[PDB]
Design a protein around this ligand. Sequence first.
Ligand code: JQT
Lengths: 126, 125
Amino acid sequence: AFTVTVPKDLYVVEYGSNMTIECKFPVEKQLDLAALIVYWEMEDKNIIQFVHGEEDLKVQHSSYRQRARLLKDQLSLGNAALQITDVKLQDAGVYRCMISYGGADYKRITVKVNAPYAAALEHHHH
Amino acid sequence: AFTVTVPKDLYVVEYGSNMTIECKFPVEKQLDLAALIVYWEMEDKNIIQFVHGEEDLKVQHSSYRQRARLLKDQLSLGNAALQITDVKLQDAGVYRCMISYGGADYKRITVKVNAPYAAALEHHH
Ligand SMILES: Cc1c(COc2cc(OCc3cccc(C#N)c3)c(CN3C[C@H](O)C[C@H]3C(=O)O)cc2Cl)cccc1-c1ccc2c(c1)OCCO2
């Protein structure tokens, strides 16, 4: 069966830092981009949509616009890697990677965000 | 772009009753069963896994054994219908139909379960 695997299902990230979260998928001889679909979301909010060679970048939910991207070079290695920069408290939660490549699967990754009082206070109130 | 559609977003069902929840996907002329994958889940629990034209029996979550099935006849018409019998309070929540058919998409369906006090009390513990 087509299986997606996750080397780390838990990530601890410091507020303001950047993170790369990964989902692995099997690629046999060489990757066929045209047959690949990669989708990332966090709590029903679209983050990455890569379809048959192209990403619909602008559909990324507003909270992530200009903040997250898929490392395209990694796909040829069978690694769907999502990089999010300038991590916020709001970024904490359960991420899902949905992959279709001659079969389909998805996995969950949990992200925890540590933050100092100043950031926490802002998040708390605003 | 491949799109899955749900005519009905919300289902309100009575405890002990039956429900059929539907997700629609486009089938051009004749269904190519080999390319189709239909997956149904609620809160990460596997309900249905239709791959290769066949349901995966041992993969369904225990809470749904004998109560849930995909109506195979409907697939050819581009309808993935999940039929659940003997609805429980535990069945209330957000369902997801994930479909791969020469493209991929998913949709969410919300189910609310009405129940009498006795059933509710048992659920409450
Ligand atoms: C993801 C996807 C599916 C997933 O369909 C399956 C999921 C499966 O599990 C999901 C699962 C099960 C249990 C735990 C987790 C976690 N945490 C995840 C299995 C059970 N699986 C059998 C294998 O052994 C793996 C195994 C498992 O890992 O448990 C089999 C199938 Cl067919 C089906 C159809 C479409 C898409 C998809 C892909 C990309 C998309 C998209 C939809 O729409 C939007 C655009 O992009």
